């Protein structure tokens, strides 16, 4: 959900 796995 965060960092390299953030989605915008």
């Amino acid at each position, epitope marked *: 959900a965060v960092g390299i*796995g953030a989605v915008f």
Partner: antibody, heavy 124, light 108 residues
Framework: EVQLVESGPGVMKPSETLSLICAVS??????????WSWVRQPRGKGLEWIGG????????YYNPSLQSRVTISRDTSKNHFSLKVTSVTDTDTAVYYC???????????????WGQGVAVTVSS | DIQMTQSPSSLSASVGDRVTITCRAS??????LSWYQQKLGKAPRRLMH???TLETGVPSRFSGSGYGTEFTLSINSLQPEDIAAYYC?????????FGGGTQVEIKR
């Protein structure tokens, strides 16, 4: 060649302010959908994430174990990503790395990069 | 505050053997897990993200598995170039946190 290169004096007396710069060359610091991190490693021990930011927003995120002492920032005119640590002590001695990693869901073909690390000694 | 508990702290196996490192998270992290390799004196280099998706250039003898709270990295045919520290990292929540690390030795 896209590369991260770190600079900054690494030898500190106790209670000085550590100041490190991470310069990207071959790319722009503003290139979107990268997650930039500062990470540190004491000799013989594991890795600790200090904090970081996404290149497409202006927030920066901090580890709570260090947030009272560190400022992480970014200067797009000089392509610099920066770490400042106030009141360093015995415990801050470590190799400090920056990293630029793709935000995978919006950037599958950008390049994951690391600095060479800077060795920080806090000593009298 | 999500703890990553990595085991074992060190492991020793002959060239060609099959080794596993495990990593358990203090709370559900779905498949938001990366594994990194660090050779002595060098920066870490990521072997995989999303629990099991290898990065480019990473030999296919490395593989990962797991979803939820327990995760495994496997090395199918341990090679001498594999002498390194290995770290898991979760990225389900800030702050990012790493496993304590595993040192890999070749048994000769």
């Amino acid at each position: 060649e896209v590369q991260l290169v770190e600079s900054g004096p690494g030898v500190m007396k106790p209670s000085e302010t550590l100041s490190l710069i991470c310069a990207v060359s071959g790319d722009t610091i503003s290139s979107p959908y990268y997650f930039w991190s500062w990470v540190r490693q004491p000799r013989g021990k594991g890795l600790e994430w200090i904090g970081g930011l996404y290149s497409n927003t202006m927030d920066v995120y901090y580890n709570p174990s260090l947030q009272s002492r560190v400022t992480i920032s970014r200067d797009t005119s000089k392509n610099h990503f920066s770490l400042k640590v106030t009141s360093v002590t015995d415990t801050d001695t470590a190799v400090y790395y920056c990293a630029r990693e793709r935000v995978v869901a919006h950037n599958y073909y950008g390049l994951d990069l690391w600095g060479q690390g800077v060795a920080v000694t806090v000593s009298s | 505050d999500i703890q990553m508990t990595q085991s074992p702290s060190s492991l020793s196996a002959s060239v060609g053997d099959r080794v596993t490192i495990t990593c358990r998270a203090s709370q559900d992290i779905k498949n938001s897990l990366s594994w990194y390799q660090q050779k002595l004196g060098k920066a870490p280099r990521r072997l995989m993200h999303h629990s099991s998706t290898l990065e480019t250039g990473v030999p296919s003898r490395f593989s990962g598995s797991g979803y939820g709270t327990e995760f495994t990295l496997s090395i199918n045919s341990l090679q001498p170039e594999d002498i390194a520290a290995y770290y898991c990292q979760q990225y389900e929540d800030f702050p990012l946190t790493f496993g304590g690390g595993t040192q890999v030795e070749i048994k000769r």
